[PDB]
Amino acid sequence: KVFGRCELAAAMKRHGLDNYRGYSLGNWVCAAKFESNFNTQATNRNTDGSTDYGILQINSRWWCNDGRTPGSRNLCNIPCSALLSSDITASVNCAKKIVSDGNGMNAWVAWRNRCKGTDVQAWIRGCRL
Numbered sequence: 001k002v003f004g005r006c007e008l009a010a011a012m013k014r015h016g017l018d019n020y021r022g023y024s025l026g027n028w029v030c031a032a033k034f035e036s037n038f039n040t041q042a043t044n045r046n047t048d049g050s051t052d053y054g055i056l057q058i059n060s061r062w063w064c065n066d067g068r069t070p071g072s073r074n075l076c077n078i079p080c081s082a083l084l085s086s087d088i089t090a091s092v093n094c095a096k097k098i099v100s101d102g103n104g105m106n107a108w109v110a111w112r113n114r115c116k117g118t119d120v121q122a123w124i125r126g127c128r129l
């Protein structure tokens with residue numbers, strides 16, 4: 001599923017991401033934009049052999065099992081495929097764990113490089129929320 005901007009904002013809010021760990025909704029929408037272009041099916045292989053999955057590009061190195069990342073963990077206790085669903089529940093639940101891990105949203109390098117310190121409120125501008 002390819003979400004619309006406001007559509008994803010609403011879904012994220014419904015699943016309790018808005019202001020989660022102190023991060024406003026616009027931060028999460030901005031992260032999703034640059035991670036996946038709002039596409040739930042997005043996958044990207046990393047040079048180390050891990051793969052990033054879904055709307056928030058969650059890494060198999062730590063967070064989900066894909067059966068092909070040697071020495072990795074599965075800290076969200078989920079198959080990485082579950083992170084590709086049209087329903088964002090699994091991705092949101094896992095993202096909550098990731099953002100609570102100590103480094104906040106810096107875990108998402110794209111967030112750090114493209115969203116951090118910017119006018120992230122623009123991402124939810126005009127949305128019926």
Ligand SMILES: NC(=[NH2+])NCCC[C@H](N)C(=O)O
Pocket residue numbers: 048059061
């Ligand atoms: N997201 C991470 N912390 N990735 C670490 C990369 C994998 C591992 N540290 C290696 O040298 O292959």
Ligand SMILES: NC(=[NH2+])NCCC[C@H](N)C(=O)O
Pocket residue numbers: 062073075101
């Ligand atoms: N991005 C990371 N380095 N995450 C590691 C989290 C550590 C994890 N709770 C463990 O015991 O393995």
Ligand SMILES: NC(=[NH2+])NCCC[C@H](N)C(=O)O
Pocket residue numbers: 035044045046057107108109110111
């Ligand atoms: N932690 C992140 N947000 N990484 C985003 C970089 C995306 C890129 N396609 C890659 O292979 O790395």
Ligand SMILES: NC(=[NH2+])NCCC[C@H](N)C(=O)O
Pocket residue numbers: 119121122123124125126
């Ligand atoms: N400042 C940005 N680059 N925002 C991205 C798009 C957000 C949206 N179109 C808005 O202004 O409400």
Ligand SMILES: [Cl-]
Pocket residue numbers: 024025026027120121122124
């Ligand atoms: Cl915001």
Ligand SMILES: [Cl-]
Pocket residue numbers: 065066067068069070071072
């Ligand atoms: Cl594995």
Ligand SMILES: [Cl-]
Pocket residue numbers: 021022103104105
């Ligand atoms: Cl933080």
Ligand code: NA
Pocket residue numbers: 060061062063064065066067069072073074
């Ligand atoms: Na894994």
